[PDB]
Paper text:
Herein we describe the structure of K. pneumoniae adenosine monophosphate nucleosidase (KpAmn), a purine salvage enzyme unique to bacteria, as determined by cryoelectron microscopy. Whereas eukaryotes can deaminate AMP to inosine monophosphate, prokaryotes cleave the adenine base from the ribose 5-phosphate moiety via AMP nucleosidase (Amn, EC 3.2.2.4), additionally salvaging adenine. In K. pneumoniae, AMP is broken down into adenine and ribose 5-phosphate by the enzyme AMP nucleosidase (Amn). The protein comprises a well-resolved C-terminal hexameric core consisting of an extensive β-sheet structure surrounded by α-helices, and a somewhat less ordered ancillary N-terminal domain, dominated by a long α-helix,forming trimeric layers on each side of the core.
In keeping with the prior E. coli structures, no significant ligand density is evident at the active sites. In the apo structure as determined, the core residues expected to stabilize the nucleobase and sugar (N205, W383, M404, E405, and D428) are well positioned to do so, whereas R381 and K436 are in alternative conformations in the absence of the interacting phosphate. The surrounding residues are well resolved; weak density outward from the active site is interpreted as residues 435–443, possibly stabilizing the apo protein while remaining flexible enough to permit AMP access. The cryo-EM structure of K. pneumoniae Amn primarily differs from the apo homologs in its loop regions away from the active site, either by lacking density for the loop entirely or being in a clearly different conformation. Notably, the loop covering the active site is strongly conserved, suggesting an important role in protein activity, ligand gating or structural stabilization, despite its weak density.
Numbering used by the authors:
A (entry chain A), B (entry chain B), C (entry chain F): 8 to 61, 80 to 155, 167 to 361, 366 to 467, 479 to 484
The structure:
Amino acid sequence: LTPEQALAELEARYEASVTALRKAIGDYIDHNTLPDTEARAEGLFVYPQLSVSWAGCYTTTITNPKLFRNYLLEQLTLLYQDYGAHISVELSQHEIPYPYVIDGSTLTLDRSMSAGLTRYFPTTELSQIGEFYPLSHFDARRVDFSLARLRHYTGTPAEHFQPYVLFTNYTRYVDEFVSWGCSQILDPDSPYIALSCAGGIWITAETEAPEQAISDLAWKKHQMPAWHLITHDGKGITLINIGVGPANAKTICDHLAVLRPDVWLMIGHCGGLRESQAIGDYVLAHAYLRDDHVLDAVLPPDIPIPSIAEVQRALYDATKQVSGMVKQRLRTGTVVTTDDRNWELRYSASALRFNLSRAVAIDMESATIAAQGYRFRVPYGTLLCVSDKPLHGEIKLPGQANRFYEGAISEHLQIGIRAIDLLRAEGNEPPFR
Amino acid sequence: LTPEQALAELEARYEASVTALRKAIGDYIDHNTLPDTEARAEGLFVYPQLSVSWAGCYTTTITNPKLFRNYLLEQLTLLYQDYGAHISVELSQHEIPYPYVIDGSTLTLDRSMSAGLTRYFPTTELSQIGEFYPLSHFDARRVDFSLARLRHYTGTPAEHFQPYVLFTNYTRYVDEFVSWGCSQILDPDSPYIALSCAGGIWITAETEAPEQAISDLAWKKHQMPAWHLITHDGKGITLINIGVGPANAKTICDHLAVLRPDVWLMIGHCGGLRESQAIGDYVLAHAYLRDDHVLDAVLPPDIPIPSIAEVQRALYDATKQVSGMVKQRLRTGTVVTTDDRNWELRYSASALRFNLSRAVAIDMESATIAAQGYRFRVPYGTLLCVSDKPLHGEIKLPGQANRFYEGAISEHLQIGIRAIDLLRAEGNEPPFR
Amino acid sequence: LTPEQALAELEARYEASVTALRKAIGDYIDHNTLPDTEARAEGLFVYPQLSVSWAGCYTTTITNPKLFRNYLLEQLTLLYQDYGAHISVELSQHEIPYPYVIDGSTLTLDRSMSAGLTRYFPTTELSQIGEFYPLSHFDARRVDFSLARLRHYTGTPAEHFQPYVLFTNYTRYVDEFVSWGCSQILDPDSPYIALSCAGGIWITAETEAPEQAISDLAWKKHQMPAWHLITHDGKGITLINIGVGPANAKTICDHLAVLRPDVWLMIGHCGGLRESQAIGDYVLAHAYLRDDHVLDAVLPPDIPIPSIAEVQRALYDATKQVSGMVKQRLRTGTVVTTDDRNWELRYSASALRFNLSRAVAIDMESATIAAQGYRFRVPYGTLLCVSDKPLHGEIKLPGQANRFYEGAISEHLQIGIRAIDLLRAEGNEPPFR
């Protein structure tokens, strides 16, 4: 089959199933009626299934054909002009849980109606989330489970996310990014055409008020707000403010992997461990020592996490170009990651390991992001800036009086954006990439 | 010595030392002059030291005699009427780091001045923070290290904290508490006389505007805001919004232990694990299964963490009185604590342990607070409310559409406050309690 | 002191002490006489000691000033024109064991004389091998312990070793290297002037017979023969045939580190693990998975072993230039190292790890050499060539009928030598490098 037919059929089947389930819920609520157990067994509430045969056959269940349109289309056409494969679209035996299809009702229901919904209708089973080979990394019951939480943690629809992701932990970066984006949109000759903020704000070049992009209500309701800078093609920039901790940088990566991004970058601040370092110097990681106890059950510390040559070259070039000069202000080394925000009180232990690995800086998130980008096959990077010297009696705090690190906050972000630009300019494994 | 003399001498010595250090910094900045190494060796920049002899002698260095006045006074008078002890006050050989005494200058200094300050003046050494026996749990260099971060994480001065602490993780509780406090202050016959909010807002009964207590800027700048409801005696209520995670509930406890509170209470929501539980039911913990990897290096999981009979009795009585009825809406059991926000994806492992311990609920903070209250000898409690049923297909999210858990948010807080009231109504170990 | 005076004094003191000990042994053997315990306590049998003061003072005992002449001289002059330091030379309190000074006698002694030598003369104590800071990595009692075994394992004097070391495991490489060197020496315009073979053979351009360099008696007596290609300056090439196993590649590195080489290169063959690989393709390592149980007590597997950018760039350039074409014949990946020569019989276990690390090849020595070059601060590299496909039913043996891997043995060595040439063309830490 030509891929266009497959896409159209998938969309039609998914729409029919969702509409049927919505109407069944509606008339059960409003008339106390149950659905037949025979017609429902005719694949009435089931996900569409796609299979390609070329050695063997690979089948998976698709969950949102209208959101993954470009990715699915290019992956299907890449296996239709270079190999010999047959494409089949049919109905599966897995059912759509009802909490995922609520977009036209208001469940102001008492306990009896909730019990009836739980009893007579499909629900989520934890034994499910986790012709004989898988075609993609994830099935439908996991992608749909993750898309429901992306909209809750972040605050923006999942249709807006862009392929180049930046992570921060300091709100001044957010202010700088919003200002720079609002300045760039007004430029007549620029790819960007719109800005989407957390909370449901859509700013274009024809809005009377540009002074509501950064409101204080966003940090009230959403744990990890995100700002997207849309492009006409679909190649923009996304900024996510994860926070502080190695457990908040793992869940967001888990939920964000299902969109298949193109690159993850980390931009933050650390604390130097070498006497030659001065506040305001850049650190580039080429190896990570993992002291965060998360991910030790699925990826043991014996497994080595390498670096990616292309990303490091891009970061070095961007630093050289933007800084306008770098053998003394930029270092390359091993960064430590810990889940203990008060490691000083136990320093006398950690010191031993800090000597065996010849570490250069310490932070709290980079190793977890690198591990998650290794597990899900996403390119990753890191570029940190020294904010204090804990071991040499110049210890400071993020947000307090610091006139040398606050100066280099509007230039660190420029280095990150230039790295993204340079990366974009150039260019048992499941067959989908 | 009578304790009054000891208190006066401690205050005078501390004030003299702080003033001397401040003036030395000032004239070094403004005239490029250094201090003598001989007069400075006359105990010019040193903490006062207090010793009591009664078997043996105990000595510690005091850091802020005017903040710990009541505690020190009662502890010293309790050892002067029941034992035979001699009290001595002198000068120690430990020096006051300069970052702790900056309250009258503005260090808009370049790199040269910062280097000079680091070289010619006392600084923080990490080998220090961690007549022959200790008189208190902590020395001065640790109390002063913690008081500097209490003011940064929270946003309020350390002189306002109250002895009865409530922990939450859901901002609706904060809104309810602020409203109830502002309503209580206006009552002519009530112990409370003022409210102190995060960010530096002081509300009394004679303020024109009571509509600025809860602003959205607090969540922008401070990670863990706190609201205090002051009382004339010093017996009020403190509310702290720690957040989500087992690593944010450990650092705040580390920094808050040095004020010697009277009780820590935890008020939040969990996810039920038993089929008989309905959304809106109360869970009371009598044992904790610790799956959070923090604190496993200083308190191994073999050590048992018991419960406190007085606190559990108070919580049961408060629930019975406020709820106005409890053998079916209230359960007692074992709660699990995990650092993985997506445990469902790995459920098939954890299930085994969930069967061996006969668990009743799952949450993310209670076990760490209980362990920290065990280490520092502070009474602790816990009272959770079921918000979803993950294993039985009724899984929900905090902040989403939930009309049965949002109803019992103005009554859960009342149960907590009544428990605090009931607890207040009644009533190698260092000699200080 | 000017460094020349220090060198002359060190040489004179060492020569005097060695001569005194030799004569004492001689006259004890030939006349049954003992040495005085008072004159001997005048520093009569002691190592010279060198100290430099510049912050603090560093002292170490020198063992062979006439062999380390250039290294010591340049390190001492580098600290005399860039810093302020004072140089002192004196006598230490450590004694020279007699087994290290036997170069003029023949101990055809019975048991009585051996017992007398052990009793009345200094001997080796195992508590010793393993003004207040160390000036170099090793002291005299360890350097002298290692120089005695370099001459036994290898078969050549320690004065001939060159700074650029190549490791092999296949004797055909040795034959090719000997032939190429003997051809290069005869060239009138070439840096090389002599060849030194294992067993004590010295070949120059004026020898009648060039057909005795490669004799079969070398493999009889010496475990790890080495061939040196001397240069007039001191910049030549050394080839060492370590053998097979991860325990023979660790002891030779231990003993060879004390000469401070400039680069270690590994050249061997592996077994591919990817279906796209064909026999005769090159693998370049950028991360090592360590399954050899040696070195797990001094460098745990948690510590990451990075790669060196300069060496990898040189290897890539050399492959591109020599091969005369490389995106398909050259791969970059993770190599596994194991101490089990029959891993196939247990494959069903190792497979799991082979999937977590995305490995590309398997060998038996590279990871140990990389770890040893990390511990002693020596640059390291690796370039392997595929010889069989164990997992895809093309398994072969080294030395058996293989007409595609035997062709690329005279070109692999050329790539290694070109890499050495390119590296030479360009260009709590002890102060000596």
